[PDB]
Amino acid sequence: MNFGSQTPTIVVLKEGTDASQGKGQIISNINACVAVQEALKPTLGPLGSD
Amino acid sequence: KQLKEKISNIGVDCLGYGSNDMKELFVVDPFIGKKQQILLATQLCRMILKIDNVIISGK
Numbered sequence: 001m002n003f004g005s006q007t008p009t010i011v012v013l014k015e016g017t018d019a020s021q022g023k024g025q026i027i028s029n030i031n032a033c034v035a036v037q038e039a040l041k042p043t044l045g046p047l048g049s050d
Numbered sequence: 051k052q053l054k055e056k057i058s059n060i061g062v063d064c065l066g067y068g069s070n071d072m073k074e075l076f077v078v079d080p081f082i083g084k085k086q087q088i089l090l091a092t093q094l095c096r097m098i099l100k101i102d103n104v105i106i107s108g109k
Contacts, residue, residue, distance in 0.1 A: 039103055049102035 013019060042049055051060060063070045 042102060048100075050097065050100035 052058065059072050060070050061072055063075070065075075067075060069075075
Protein backbone atom coordinates (compact mmCIF):
# COMPACT_ATOMS: atom_id res chain seq x y z
CA MET A 1 0.00 0.00 0.00
CA ASN A 2 2.85 2.33 0.88
CA PHE A 3 5.14 3.63 -1.86
CA GLY A 4 8.45 2.83 -0.15
CA SER A 5 10.45 1.71 2.91
CA GLN A 6 9.72 4.70 5.24
CA THR A 7 8.03 8.11 5.19
CA PRO A 8 9.67 11.00 7.13
CA THR A 9 7.38 13.50 8.81
CA ILE A 10 6.76 16.97 7.37
CA VAL A 11 8.04 20.06 9.15
CA VAL A 12 5.20 22.59 9.23
CA LEU A 13 7.34 25.68 8.64
CA LYS A 14 9.99 25.74 5.92
CA GLU A 15 13.37 24.19 6.69
CA GLY A 16 15.55 26.85 8.32
CA THR A 17 12.67 29.13 9.42
CA ASP A 18 13.44 30.38 12.94
CA ALA A 19 10.55 30.58 15.41
CA SER A 20 10.16 30.66 19.19
CA GLN A 21 7.41 30.90 21.82
CA GLY A 22 7.33 32.29 25.34
CA LYS A 23 8.72 35.40 26.99
CA GLY A 24 12.28 34.76 25.77
CA GLN A 25 11.88 36.33 22.33
CA ILE A 26 10.34 39.61 23.51
CA ILE A 27 13.17 39.94 26.05
CA SER A 28 15.65 39.29 23.23
CA ASN A 29 13.92 41.97 21.14
CA ILE A 30 14.12 44.42 24.05
CA ASN A 31 17.78 43.52 24.66
CA ALA A 32 18.43 44.03 20.94
CA CYS A 33 17.08 47.58 21.17
CA VAL A 34 19.10 48.20 24.35
CA ALA A 35 22.20 46.98 22.48
CA VAL A 36 21.55 49.62 19.81
CA GLN A 37 20.68 52.09 22.59
CA GLU A 38 24.11 51.76 24.25
CA ALA A 39 25.83 52.98 21.07
CA LEU A 40 23.90 56.28 21.27
CA LYS A 41 24.01 56.58 25.09
CA PRO A 42 27.22 58.67 25.46
CA THR A 43 26.44 60.64 22.27
CA LEU A 44 23.57 62.51 23.96
CA GLY A 45 24.49 65.97 25.23
CA PRO A 46 26.57 69.02 24.41
CA LEU A 47 29.37 67.12 25.92
CA GLY A 48 28.93 63.85 23.90
CA SER A 49 31.18 62.01 21.46
CA ASP A 50 30.87 61.34 17.74
CA LYS B 51 64.75 86.83 23.88
CA GLN B 52 61.18 87.26 22.61
CA LEU B 53 59.93 87.85 26.16
CA LYS B 54 62.53 90.61 26.57
CA GLU B 55 62.40 92.35 23.17
CA LYS B 56 59.16 93.17 21.35
CA ILE B 57 60.61 92.61 17.85
CA SER B 58 58.93 89.43 16.55
CA ASN B 59 60.92 88.42 13.43
CA ILE B 60 63.58 86.18 15.05
CA GLY B 61 63.33 82.42 14.47
CA VAL B 62 65.33 79.25 13.91
CA ASP B 63 68.24 79.72 11.49
CA CYS B 64 68.57 76.34 9.74
CA LEU B 65 71.25 77.16 7.13
CA GLY B 66 73.80 77.93 9.87
CA TYR B 67 74.15 81.69 9.55
CA GLY B 68 75.71 83.69 12.37
CA SER B 69 72.68 85.98 12.88
CA ASN B 70 69.14 84.81 13.64
CA ASP B 71 67.46 88.09 12.62
CA MET B 72 65.37 87.32 9.54
CA LYS B 73 65.38 90.89 8.17
CA GLU B 74 68.74 90.12 6.51
CA LEU B 75 68.10 86.46 5.55
CA PHE B 76 65.38 87.22 2.92
CA VAL B 77 62.54 84.99 4.20
CA VAL B 78 58.86 85.99 3.95
CA ASP B 79 55.62 83.95 4.26
CA PRO B 80 51.92 84.86 3.74
CA PHE B 81 49.45 85.44 6.55
CA ILE B 82 46.69 83.37 4.92
CA GLY B 83 49.08 80.42 4.64
CA LYS B 84 50.33 80.41 8.23
CA LYS B 85 46.80 81.03 9.54
CA GLN B 86 45.35 77.94 7.84
CA GLN B 87 47.89 75.70 9.60
CA ILE B 88 46.27 76.53 12.95
CA LEU B 89 42.66 76.67 11.73
CA LEU B 90 42.57 73.39 9.79
CA ALA B 91 44.56 71.68 12.57
CA THR B 92 42.46 72.83 15.53
CA GLN B 93 39.20 72.24 13.62
CA LEU B 94 40.22 68.71 12.59
CA CYS B 95 41.37 67.64 16.08
CA ARG B 96 37.94 68.55 17.46
CA MET B 97 36.53 65.90 15.11
CA ILE B 98 39.30 63.43 16.00
CA LEU B 99 38.65 63.80 19.74
CA LYS B 100 34.89 63.40 19.53
CA ILE B 101 35.10 59.87 18.07
CA ASP B 102 34.25 57.19 20.66
CA ASN B 103 32.85 54.27 18.63
CA VAL B 104 35.13 53.08 15.80
CA ILE B 105 33.67 50.43 13.47
CA ILE B 106 35.82 49.26 10.53
CA SER B 107 34.24 46.81 8.09
CA GLY B 108 36.92 44.48 6.78
CA LYS B 109 37.16 44.34 3.00
